[PDB]
Design a binder for these strands. Structure first.
Lengths: 87, 217, 129, 62, 206, 125
RNA sequence: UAAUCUAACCAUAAACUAUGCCGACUAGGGAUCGGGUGGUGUUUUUUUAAUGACCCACUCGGCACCUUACGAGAAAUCAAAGU
């Protein structure tokens, strides 16, 4: 949101979920956010780099969380052959 | 003095967090009321209703005193809590602390065109608790706040200049009315409007950028 | 028994987007289902969709993004004049700058801004935001 | 906008408020009248414009 | 984006099939049906071991991505796990919890047992859910050792196991403990086997 | 007719947690000790407080504590051979160097396609 | 796809009540009752194929029951009393 002149005039833009594109507010106290570690050519881990996933409050309560991890992670090449579209 | 005993509290005592929005972006839980005071020094309260209430323990009629206290800015932050206690002046000061603990933002938008500051709400919203419903509606300039006096006084301290109300249900138990206007504000960040459609990448928490600090001994 | 086909072809959508799914299955299709869908697709509210046919009246499989709050139908299709769009639009829609109510009008099915600058009017059909 | 009743009845309402001196001369836009206040007419009476212009020592001497 | 040194070793799976950890329980629930290879005519179902290793390196890619290695907490309340958690947390640095979990220990900072972790690792979330339910209040991701009778609510990345045997509960801690050190750089080469006997992590009573 | 109140019970295990190597299974010595490391107002209260610590202290020579104990930190770290076997129970050498599995589980390893020395038996039901 | 199928009794059962009723959609769980399709599984035996009973898995239709609750409600509670 921005005025006639052009500057943003919210307080501060909030975080969308990543499995269902909802919006996570300041009292969604089950809204997990999870990092994984990039890897090295020798087989070690860079201490400073991540890949970040944000999951909403209610994809976890129904129990649909871990499958939504496997769907999300496998697009980024983390896994192979553990999730399948045509169920 | 102030000893932080929660690991958010050490991060803000040392001054690694300068605005309250870093608590709100990563939605962090807060459990120490001194965090808000340094963060928002302009906060300011009023007391709404004080009512004696009674319990027939041992057939000895011991008096409590329930209090309804709203705290709030005049920019976009509010708060509201309720506490019963044995003595009158303890129930007020205990009632302030829960209200300092529960602070939420509010998205403030326009009516129509785009000249200058925002005054009214972004959309229409509604919260219901108990049996009361309260629904808030955008208004043009010059409107002001049309509500009951106990609800007009809430929306001054969140700083909405013009808004239209409409409330159903038994509105004459005010502990339940204010608990519905509260829900009907805090949903304003949560309606995905179309300008919020774009994509952004996820930021990273302060609770592990400064991880060596704010760690126990 | 089954009276309106469109009225529960939009009841099947938001009933399975309140639970955060990504795709739904509609049955039967219609000539006025598809054009209601093709105006929630040039505005971004849904993704893409496919039309089966099985020689009776086909099914549809739609792909939903994240962006619908509600889509609906208004069941006596009343007769909107031209001075009376803006009383229907001040009641159904959440704010003055987004959302749409769509109409069946003598020059096609369209939304309510698109009917202003063509200067037409017709019967109501539904809303979307 | 560009609706000929807005342009004829707007630019007359604006023109009358400036001609008595309530709207500011840089606020000649139609949205700016929706935040006008009640003492912006109260400061144009003769009881108030004669005390400011140095003729009476108080507002009850006007 | 993980090279062939991260593939499943034929020697490694020789342990798992020896450890009888590929025998699920006789009643699948509806959420874990991707993990089932095929049903036996006896009545049991066979877990896909190539899946249970592929979602084993992922947890270690989360455990290694934390700054302070004492912010992981590992919990059990069954007898069969509460040795294996200790030797896990021994030479990695997590803060173990065995025996009884006291209620209100991730909230209520006036307790002496108050903790504020970054992950939680549980074994059997059927009979353990107090740590599951409380972590839901304060934004704590969680990892479980899921059977096929496991209520998988609030639970992220979920290692499929057999939570009935005694080797099979212990061994999955051991292979997890082996892998987390390799990522840290605390070891030298992926291809060399672990010097420690895996029978150390077990449980025995006279 | 004589059980000990919590203010005996509570402070007896506070003293055992800060000065455990200093204590001793004989009562007559550490009677002379609690006055040094703590402040006891009366005299009979000291005699009761040191009475049950020594009775608590001989539990330590048989079992574990309900406070903290660094035998967990060191002698349970000597319990890293509760019994470590010299040959593992998970050793295929006990199975003549060949793994004994069911029928259709052999298709699982053939699915991922590995070369293992396994045998196959017959199943009932 | 719509005109309104001994007797008589006295209420002496908190005498549970804002349910064209037809239609679509929305989470689990196991028992039982009909009809059908499967199976290297059994066993009366004609034989460990089958008739034959069992047993297992799916399937369309039934009166019930136990869970939870995103939801709904003034609450008790409710897979509809939800959308």
């Amino acid at each position: 949101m921005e005025n006639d002149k052009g500057q943003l005039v919210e307080l501060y833009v909030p975080r969308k979920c990543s499995a269902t594109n909802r919006i996570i507010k300041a009292d969604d106290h089950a809204s997990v956010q999870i990092n994984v570690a990039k890897v090295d050519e020798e087989g070690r881990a860079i201490p400073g780099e991540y890949v970040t996933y944000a999951l909403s409050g209610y994809v976890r309560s129904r129990g649909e969380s871990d499958d939504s991890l496997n769907r999300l992670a496998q697009n980024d090449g983390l896994l192979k052959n553990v999730w399948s579209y045509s169920r | 003095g102030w000893v932080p005993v929660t690991k958010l509290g050490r991060l803000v005592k040392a001054g690694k967090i300068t605005t309250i929005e870093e608590i709100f972006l990563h939605s962090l839980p807060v459990k120490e009321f001194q965090i808000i005071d340094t963060l928002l020094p302009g906060l300011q309260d009023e007391v709404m209703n004080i009512k004696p209430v009674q319990k027939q323990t041992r057939a000895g009629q011991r008096t409590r005193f329930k209090a309804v206290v709203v705290v709030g800015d005049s920019n976009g932050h509010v708060g509201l809590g309720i506490k019963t206690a044995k003595e009158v002046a303890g129930a007020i000061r205990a009632g302030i602390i829960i209200a300092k603990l529960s602070v939420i933002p509010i998205r403030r938008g326009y009516w129509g065109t785009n000249l200058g500051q925002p005054h009214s709400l972004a959309t229409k919203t509604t919260g219901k608790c108990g049996s009361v419903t309260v629904r808030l509606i955008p208004a043009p300039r010059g409107s002001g706040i049309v509500a009951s006096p106990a609800v007009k006084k809430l929306l001054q301290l969140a700083g909405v200049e013009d808004v239209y109300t409409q409330s159903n249900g038994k509105t004459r138990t005010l502990e339940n009315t204010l608990k519905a206007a509260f829900v009907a504000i805090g949903n304003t960040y949560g309606f995905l409007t179309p300008n919020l459609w774009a994509e952004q990448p996820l930021p990273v928490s302060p609770l592990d950028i400064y991880s060596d600090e704010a760690s126990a001994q | 028994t089954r009276s309106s086909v469109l009225a529960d072809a939009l009841n099947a959508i938001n009933n399975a987007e309140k639970t955060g799914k990504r795709q739904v299955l509609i049955r039967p299709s219609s000539k006025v289902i598809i054009k209601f869908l093709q105006v929630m697709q040039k505005h971004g509210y849904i993704g893409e969709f496919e039309y089966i046919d099985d020689h009776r009246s086909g099914k549809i499989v739609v792909q939903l993004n994240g962006r619908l709050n509600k889509c609906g139908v208004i069941s006596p299709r009343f007769n909107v004049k031209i001075g009376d769009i803006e009383k229907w639009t001040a009641n159904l829609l959440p704010a003055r700058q987004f959302g749409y109510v769509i109409l069946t009008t003598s020059a096609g099915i369209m939304d309510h801004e698109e009917a202003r600058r063509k200067h037409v009017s017709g019967k109501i059909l539904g809303f979307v935001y | 906008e560009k609706d000929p009743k807005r342009l004829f009845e707007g630019n007359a309402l604006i023109r009358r408020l400036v001609r008595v001196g309530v709207l500011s001369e840089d606020k000649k836009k139609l949205d700016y009248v929706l935040a006008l206040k009640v003492e912006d007419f109260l400061e144009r009476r003769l009881q108030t414009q004669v005390y400011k212009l140095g003729l009476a020592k108080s507002v009850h001497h006007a | 984006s993980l090279p062939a040194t991260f593939d499943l070793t034929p020697e490694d799976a020789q342990l798992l099939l020896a450890a009888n950890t590929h025998l699920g329980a006789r009643n699948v629930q509806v959420h874990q049906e991707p993990y089932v290879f095929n049903a036996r005519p006896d009545g049991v179902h066979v877990i896909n071991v190539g899946k249970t290793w592929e979602k084993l390196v992922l947890a270690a890619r989360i455990i290694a991505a934390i700054p302070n290695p004492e912010d992981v907490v590992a919990i059990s309340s069954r007898t069969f796990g509460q040795r294996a958690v200790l030797k896990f947390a021994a030479h990695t640095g997590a803060t173990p919890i065995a025996g009884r979990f006291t209620p209100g220990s991730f909230t209520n900072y006036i307790t002496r047992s108050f903790k504020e972790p970054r992950l939680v690792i549980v074994t059997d979330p059927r009979s353990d859910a107090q740590a599951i339910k409380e972590a839901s209040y304060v934004n704590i991701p969680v990892i479980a050792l899921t059977d096929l009778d496991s209520p998988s609510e609030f639970v992220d990345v979920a290692i499929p196991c057999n939570n009935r045997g005694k080797h099979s509960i212990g061994l999955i801690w051991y292979l997890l403990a082996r892998e987390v050190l390799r990522l840290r750089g605390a070891l030298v080469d992926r291809t060399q086997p672990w010097s420690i006997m895996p029978d150390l992590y077990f449980y025995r009573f006279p | 007719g004589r059980v000990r109140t919590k203010t005996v019970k509570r402070a007896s295990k506070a003293l055992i947690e800060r000065y455990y190597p200093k204590l001793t299974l004989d009562f007559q010595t550490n009677k002379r000790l609690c006055d040094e490391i703590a402040t006891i107002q009366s005299k009979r209260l000291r005699n009761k407080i040191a009475g049950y610590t020594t009775h608590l202290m001989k539990r330590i020579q048989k079992g574990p504590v309900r406070g903290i104990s660094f035998k967990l930190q060191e002698e349970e770290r000597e319990r890293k051979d509760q019994y470590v076997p010299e040959v593992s129970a998970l050793d295929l050498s006990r199975s003549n160097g060949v793994l004994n599995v069911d029928n259709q589980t052999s298709d699982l390893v053939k699915s991922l396609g590995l070369k293992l020395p396994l045998s196959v038996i017959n199943v009932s039901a």
